[PDB]
Design an enzyme around this catalytic site. Sequence first.
Site, PDB file in Angstrom:
ATOM      1  N   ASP A 196       0.753  -1.310   0.123  1.00  0.00           N
ATOM      2  CA  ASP A 196      -0.043  -0.098  -0.056  1.00  0.00           C
ATOM      3  C   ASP A 196       0.982   1.100   0.051  1.00  0.00           C
ATOM      4  OD1 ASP A 196      -1.964   1.980   0.418  1.00  0.00           O
ATOM      5  OD2 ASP A 196      -1.998   1.295   2.543  1.00  0.00           O
ATOM      6  N   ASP A 213      -1.784   5.457  -5.707  1.00  0.00           N
ATOM      7  CA  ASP A 213      -2.303   4.622  -4.328  1.00  0.00           C
ATOM      8  C   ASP A 213      -2.317   3.279  -5.050  1.00  0.00           C
ATOM      9  OD1 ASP A 213      -3.033   3.689  -1.985  1.00  0.00           O
ATOM     10  OD2 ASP A 213      -4.963   4.961  -2.113  1.00  0.00           O
TER      11      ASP A 213
END
EC number: 3.4.23.46
Length: 374
Positions: free
Chosen positions: A34, A217
């Site tokens: 992430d 992201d």
Amino acid sequence: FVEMVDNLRGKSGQGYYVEMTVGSPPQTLNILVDTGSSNFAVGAAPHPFLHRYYQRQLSSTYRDLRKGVYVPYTQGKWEGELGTDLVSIPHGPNVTVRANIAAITESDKFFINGSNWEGILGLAYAEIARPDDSLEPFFDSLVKQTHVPNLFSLQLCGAGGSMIIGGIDHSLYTGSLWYTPIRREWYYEVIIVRVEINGQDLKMDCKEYNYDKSIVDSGTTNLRLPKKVFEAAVKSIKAASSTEKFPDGFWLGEQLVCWQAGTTPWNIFPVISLYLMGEVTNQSFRITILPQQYLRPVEDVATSQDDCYKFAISQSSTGTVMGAVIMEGFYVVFDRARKRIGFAVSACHVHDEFRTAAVEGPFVTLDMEDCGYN
Ligand SMILES: COc1cncc(-c2cccc(CNc3cccnc3N)c2)c1
């Protein structure tokens, strides 16, 4: 890097994960990769959705930092105990680091029922680390304690992938890598300076594209655009595709659209180009996203047997998010050493009968700084 190729598993839907080992003797866990967060945090208690979890007290190298952490989202949270332990990436570089770990002891709407991962590797910068920016993120520890170069690159495939830690693998991309500056080291924030649909300028003030930031992201599925940009985009994608009617629900991600297996009319759907601020003054480059990246196939539904897709572009609360749907078309190089992010067409991108994705430049775009929201 041959040994790191193909070290990720999963889909853009539930995220991509990498095997890690924590503690001594080693405990093997799957960890969401992430780039939109900065904590290394692992399930440390038998939440029912978890296959595995971290048992701190069986690790001889665990050190309690005697400090809790609490991370809330809109409708949930995770919570836990800070400590440090020895960490490794079986299919990563051949090193062990002592990293900060948040032993997740209690959480809410965090873990996904049915996922095969048990923790989160927050690869973004210390500034957005919790509880504050003094909790050294994982990658920072890896680089400080080893001679692994201060970069990594992601090839997300599906529709698994590779995380090359410490460099770049030529075989994971075609064409050339172009680099956009990381604007601030917190999220991997970037500047979108221009947007086009089939070559047609969307014609808005570029501050709209980055209101109030744009980020890369891997912990978000969709391309997410701010409200005004999202509406402009959908109107334009409707226009290019007006030879068919779709439910309003489709454009809101609530309803699917189906065609006879093999007859999806891709030509009807436009390529989206995002121009990114370049490394040189008044210079930009463009990344070209294809409909097969924003029309995400939807498999066994209730009980479906056609070809069906949902719209993987959605409205953003906090600026443009280049989620996995966008990253999946590209090989993205997170060059932390040189505050920059590189894009090149991914070797594993979904091709289209007549159009080929691209990253290309240079273009001249004046006053690019003004696209930044302050
Ligand atoms: C594509 O990646 C994901 C898909 N589904 C869920 C997650 C997920 C689940 C729990 C926590 C987090 C934390 N990270 C977020 C959350 C929201 C937006 N961006 C990021 N980076 C992600 C990631």
